[PDB]
Design a protein around this ligand. Structure first.
Ligand SMILES: [Zn+2]
Ligand SMILES: [Zn+2]
Ligand SMILES: [Zn+2]
Ligand SMILES: [Zn+2]
Ligand SMILES: [Zn+2]
Ligand SMILES: [Zn+2]
Ligand SMILES: [Zn+2]
Ligand SMILES: [Zn+2]
Lengths: 70, 66, 69, 70, 68, 71
């Protein structure tokens, strides 16, 4: 296992399938919404209010319903 | 990147944003300028922010990238 | 030299479905099984599955002895 | 855009011996003048001089406005 | 080089099987013996082996003095 | 402006002249001792006794007395 071989498809699936996710920050704050876009550094989280999240600040990404990866 | 168009949009359009630090602290103002590692946030006081200490950037209003 | 320990270790936990505790850098403790992982993240399965960034992990503690191949 | 903003800013602050406050990621506030810097550290001069790792800095806040050109 | 200090330091602790304290950036204190290590993690053996990410480590403190 | 052009001379100086220093960690903690050595990633802090410190965990290094740098 190497590179983003898991992260990319995982996030890309949450995105393509517009899955409601909770994103827990290292500082203990919880964000919620849908992944609109992402790259090596950040994730765009769309909600009542959209926002750009730095991945280096993310602890865990918890999908609201189970997700199967290709 | 997603980061560059995003921030440059906020800059160009002078969008009021809230930057939450990696320690919970919130900063408010406008993205005056930025490079790969820092952002200049202009308010009644202008200040340089290290991206590495940012958790999330939240625009006051919705924005769209071309 | 960076992978020679980490990957065999994570893979072994994965292959043998060993229950692990994953302590986060903010002091929170997660539990489950290592379903998959790459260079940057780990997929942890419990009743509720979740993706964990390695950069937020301090330590990984298996529920029982794990021998490296 | 690389250091295009960071170098000029820091170099300007150093050149003009501008008083600054440096807030660390842990909320701690340092104060004094930027005497020098490299890719990783800043030398902050005051009654006590000290070497600050950039990785530990949240924000750098000048005591007065600065003109952008290095 | 890249590791001219870190490697010999950790290797010596691994060889002499010296009991060490590993303080994490978040305060917590781990204890045991360095069983093995690579560039990014340390395997710390106590009641059972735990893998410690180097990025989360503040300081490594041996129970007794060590010569490089 | 590039590399450890400042970090190395400074750290090398503290080591050469065996200056007592305080090293404040990102978590607030404060370590004291003398810089015995360092490389790209860590600093060896000689006290009673020697402690390896990750640079990634350090916020600031404060010498006990003023320190001049070469040229
Ligand atoms: Zn890998
Ligand atoms: Zn990716
Ligand atoms: Zn860019
Ligand atoms: Zn627009
Ligand atoms: Zn086994
Ligand atoms: Zn090495
Ligand atoms: Zn530069
Ligand atoms: Zn160096």
């Amino acid at each position: 296992s190497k590179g983003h071989s898991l992260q990319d498809p995982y996030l890309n699936t949450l995105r393509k399938e517009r899955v409601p996710v909770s994103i827990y920050l290292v500082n203990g704050i919880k964000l919620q919404g849908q992944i609109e876009s992402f790259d090596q550094f950040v994730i765009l989280l769309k909600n009542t209010v959209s926002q750009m999240v730095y991945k280096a600040a993310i602890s865990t990404v918890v999908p609201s319903r189970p997700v199967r990866l290709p």
